[PDB]
Write a protein that binds this ligand. Structure first.
Ligand SMILES: NS(=O)(=O)c1ccc(NC(=O)CSC(=O)N2CCCc3cc(Cl)cc(Cl)c32)c(Cl)c1
Lengths: 558, 405
């Protein structure tokens, strides 16, 4: 195997740090012998060099046998040198997504033989790679070598190799702009739109160019055939798709089977639309051991079932055509679950995906929709370098109402309404004005930090009044309670005045679902209502009936 | 030119900041710009042994087709602060905010002909990412003073001084202040003469390579918190009026509500009008009288950060406050508008920054009423300045919004 003549990459240890010097443990004779055989071969091939004992550095060597086989493998434990080597630049900051690859007429995969050994190591660095095959027992100085190429498991190898591969490809690229090569580890993906003709030719020219730099690769009849499996996907001449997924037939589920299931479904959801996972996830929370069986909830069951249904029979994604548009569609799937598909030509998907995240404690469909739009928008820029035209299940008017009045700044790239129920809508509006001839409730809550007991109640202005007690609450809780009462005892139209900016905040946002049971009840009230007007006053400022509901819930609490 | 030596703030090292994804057009634009600077020696490709990173973006700058490059050195600036600020710090003229006119001049081309200390260059690495991660980022570092790095003008200080010495000598009453890549030039001249002096000054710069847009500070007066006048006052209105009144003090030394307050007692209907006691009107007016007055007792403290908050007010309007200590406003104002929410927010942010530069010579840390991802994906679409302030993201208190209406 050749050792690329290419320029070296200068390497340093970390400032105020010196190379390693960890002592070599004593080995058995068979181990000792195996290493001698392995090393002199590497030495012959130029991969290593013998050194004196003037060099003061050392890294443990070990030798293991073979998973099944009968050869020996040499293990050099670079932990110590690794903790002393500088940091490098991140190898590869993301991986292409298949839905972003342009179609090529013809593509072939090359792989480099012995990547790391084919490339040299900064001279002034080799000395720190010193290792020692010891002699039989303590006696005798051991045999001592150091590396001349990139060692396996050293911190800088992935970066410098790939950095090297780039340097080496740069020109060929230059004089071949219409051929794309993708570098992954020690694979090359090479595609072009030339007829097989000088595709193979052009391949050959690549190979030579590589071989000229000390890099060797397979030849026709040696190279993988499509579909090329990779990073979990399946790549075909005209499509791509995730690698085969199998949901095991199973009587009993352990935490561990379900964790794995959830993982395959998630993965599956990049191209199988409608994949659901909530019910399954629900099972995992507050978890026990991996080996523990979990009884499958009935929703979890309908969910598992509808998932086997979807996976029943293959689905694939298409590749990307830069001369056409990107359309993204989103459907509300339910309990905070969103689903989406991206295509260029109606219904031939490039990819699919889902969004669920609970963003905040209380939220509404309109906020979720636009969070999904953001997340999909970022993904498009990464994958295609442009944002898609959106098609959303929400009227222009609804959107306009909401964005316009919301405190927080918002935006959405080009979209159009599409009529696919469930449609997104606000489930109630607070008034802008006080309602004439509707009862005013002045509500209030108070909690004792010690006892954690609380009172909550109200006083209206037709003299009505009420006060409830609560036994393990908080101020926040007593103040939602107080508003919840005022909503229980008032019928279709009501003005409510609280001094809780907290409840106000939550409610002005038109939440339509929450993690708080209490906040939900408040919601069904607000939806039953017909005209609610809510308003804030600062508490403990002798003021309206506020001062009364105050003393009312204070007596006893504080 | 022998270079000046630049060192980090002891016990910490270079920026390793992630590069936001860029759209195809901005990447292409960056590949051109970058191929050129390289040919001209401004920057050189680097190798994997440089682990540093600073994000890079492409913008336009008001009324221009030419894409232009913008490097985000916010992080680098923090890490070398000791250098640019208290070692080669640039004094800031209190006079500037006084002038009738201030013209702002891009002067960052100056920097590319001063070489960068060889041992520092690695700290200026940046990356041009590629779409769908198909190819590794193109990686570069600077060989010369980079635009947007607070080190550049600190170092270029004395040259700037030589360049301006003639023009200064001849115009004792014009103030010239440099901040990052820009020159602020303010005078009390009629506007024709002003514009004429700025042309004249363009010619000087023009003799050293360097190659306007107009502020009018001395007329940036208060955004006084406003209370309503109106005959007829509902229970609700008063309720609101004391909420606002109430909040107003805390910053406003000796605001009063007692009188006003009495009006409401018992538990009345909200929609019930009520008369007024004209001693309540006495408060109102003084309050008002006060509410239009410089905060008594609040002063720029040079050793503390500046903070800016911005509330969305609908109908294209935005309010904002600059302060160092909550409710101790150094300044407040509004900004007003085919313009969406993000576009306008970006404009307000720039405007406020540049006011903040003129007045204090440092930019504020912004609290933005917007979701991180939206901001980050959108802001460069409208950004036009050559600097970038710090920012956080927040949820406006419901009340703050109206208490500044
Ligand atoms: N040789 S072929 O049978 O005719 C054939 C043609 C095209 C394809 N696929 C494509 O056209 C799109 S993918 C492709 O060409 N490339 C080169 C560009 C980047 C890249 C990255 C990866 Cl991970 C995989 C591939 Cl297959 C690729 C395949 Cl899988 C096979």
């Amino acid at each position: 195997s050749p050792i690329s003549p290419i320029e070296t990459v200068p390497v340093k240890l970390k400032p105020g740090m010196d190379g390693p010097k960890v002592k070599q443990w004593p080995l058995t004779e068979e181990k000792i012998k195996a290493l001698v055989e392995i090393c002199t071969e590497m030495e012959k091939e130029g991969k290593i060099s013998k050194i004196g004992p003037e060099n003061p550095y050392n890294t443990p060597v070990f030798a293991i046998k073979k998973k099944d086989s009968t050869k020996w493998r040499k293990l050099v434990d670079f932990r110590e040198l690794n903790k002393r080597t500088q940091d490098f630049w991140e190898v590869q900051l993301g991986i292409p997504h298949p839905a972003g690859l342009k179609k090529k007429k013809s593509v072939t995969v090359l792989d480099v033989g012995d990547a790391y050994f084919s490339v040299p190591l900064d001279e002034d660095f080799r000395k720190y790679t010193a290792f020692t095959i010891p002699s039989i027992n303590n006696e005798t100085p051991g045999i001592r070598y150091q590396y001349n190429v990139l060692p396996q498991g050293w911190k800088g190898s992935p970066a410098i190799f790939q950095s090297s591969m780039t340097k080496i490809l740069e020109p060929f690229r230059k004089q071949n702009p219409d051929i794309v090569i993708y570098q992954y580890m020690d694979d090359l993906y090479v595609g072009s739109d030339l007829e097989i003709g000088q595709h193979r030719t052009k391949i050959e020219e690549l190979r030579q160019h590589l071989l000229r730099w000390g890099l060797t690769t397979p030849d026709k009849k040696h190279q993988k055939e499509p579909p090329f499996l990779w990073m979990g996907y399946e790549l075909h001449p005209d499509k791509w798709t995730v690698q085969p997924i199998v949901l095991p037939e199973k009587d009993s589920w352990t935490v561990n089977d379900i964790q794995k299931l959830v993982g395959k479904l998630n993965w599956a959801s990049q191209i199988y639309p409608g994949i659901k996972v909530r019910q399954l996830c629900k099972l995992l929370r507050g978890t026990k051991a991996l080996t523990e069986v979990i009884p499958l909830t009935e929703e979890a069951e309908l969910e598992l079932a509808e998932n086997r249904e979807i996976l029943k029979e293959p689905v694939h994604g298409v590749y990307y055509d830069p001369s056409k548009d990107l359309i993204a569609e989103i459907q509300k799937q339910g309990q905070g679950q969103w689903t989406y598909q991206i295509y260029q030509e109606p219904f031939k998907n490039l990819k699919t995906g889902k969004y669920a995240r609970m963003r905040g404690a209380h939220t509404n469909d309109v906020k979720q929709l636009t969070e999904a739009v953001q997340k999909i928008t970022t993904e498009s820029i990464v994958i295609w370098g442009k944002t898609p035209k959106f098609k959303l299940p929400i009227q222009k008017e609804t959107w306009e109402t909401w964005w316009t009045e919301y405190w927080q700044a918002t935006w959405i790239p080009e979209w159009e309404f599409v009529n696919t129920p469930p449609l997104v809508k606000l489930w109630y509006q607070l008034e802008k004005e006080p309602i004439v001839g509707a009862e005013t409730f002045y509500v209030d809550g108070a909690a004792n930090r010690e006892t954690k007991l609380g009172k909550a109640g109200y006083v209206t202005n037709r003299g009505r009044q009420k006060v409830v007690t609560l036994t393990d609450t908080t101020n926040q809780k007593t103040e939602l309670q107080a508003i919840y009462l005022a909503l229980q005892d008032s019928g279709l139209e009501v003005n409510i005045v609280t001094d809780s900016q907290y409840a106000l905040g939550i409610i002005q946002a038109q939440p339509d679902q929450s993690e708080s049971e209490l906040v939900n009840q408040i919601i069904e009230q607000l939806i039953k209502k017909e005209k609610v007007y809510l308003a804030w006053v600062p508490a403990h400022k002798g003021i309206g009936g506020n001062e009364q509901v105050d003393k009312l819930v204070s007596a006893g609490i504080r | 030119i022998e270079t000046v030596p630049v060192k980090l703030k002891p016990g910490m090292d270079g920026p390793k900041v992630k590069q936001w994804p860029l759209t195809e057009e901005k990447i292409k634009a960056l590949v051109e710009i970058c191929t050129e600077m390289e040919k001209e020696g401004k920057i050189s490709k680097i190798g994997p042994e440089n682990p540093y990173n600073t994000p890079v973006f492409a913008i336009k700058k008001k009324d221009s087709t030419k894409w232009r490059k913008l490097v985000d050195f916010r992080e680098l600036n923090k890490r070398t602060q000791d250098f640019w600020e208290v070692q080669l710090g640039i004094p800031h003229p209190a006079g500037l905010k006084k002038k009738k006119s201030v013209t702002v001049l891009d002067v960052g081309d100056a920097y590319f002909s001063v070489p960068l200390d060889e041992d520092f260059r690695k700290y200026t690495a940046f990356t041009i990412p590629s779409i769908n991660n198909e190819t590794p980022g193109i990686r570069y570092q600077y060989n010369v003073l980079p635009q947007g790095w607070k080190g550049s003008p600190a170092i270029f200080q004395s040259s700037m001084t030589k360049i301006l010495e003639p023009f200064r000598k001849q115009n004792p009453d014009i103030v010239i202040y440099q901040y990052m890549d820009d020159l602020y030039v303010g005078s009390d001249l009629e506007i024709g003469q002003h514009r004429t002096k700025i042309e004249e000054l363009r010619q000087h710069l023009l003799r050293w390579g360097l190659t306007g847009y107009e502020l009018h500070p001395d007329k940036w007066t208060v955004q006084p918190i406003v209370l309503p006048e109106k005959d007829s006052w509902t229970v609700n209105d008063i309720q609101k009026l004391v909420g606002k009144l109430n909040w107003a003090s805390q910053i406003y030394p000796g605001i009063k509500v007692r009188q006003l307050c009495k009006l409401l007692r018992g538990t009345k209907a909200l929609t019930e009008v009520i008369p007024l006691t004209e001693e309540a009107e006495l408060e109102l007016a003084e309050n008002r009288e006060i509410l239009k007055e410089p905060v008594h007792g609040v002063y720029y403290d040079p050793s503390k950060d500046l903070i800016a908050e911005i509330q969305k007010q609908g109908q294209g309007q935005w309010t904002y406050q600059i302060y160092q200590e909550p409710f101790k406003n150094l300044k407040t104002g509004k900004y007003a508008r085919h313009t969406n929410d993000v576009k306008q927010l970006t404009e307000a942010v720039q405007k406020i920054t540049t006011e903040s530069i003129v007045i204090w010579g440092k930019t504020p840390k912004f609290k933005l009423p917007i979701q991180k991802e939206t901001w980050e994906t959108w802001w460069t679409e409208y950004w036009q300045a050559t600097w970038i302030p710090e920012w956080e993201f927040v949820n406006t208190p419901p009340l703050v919004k109206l208490w500044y209406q």
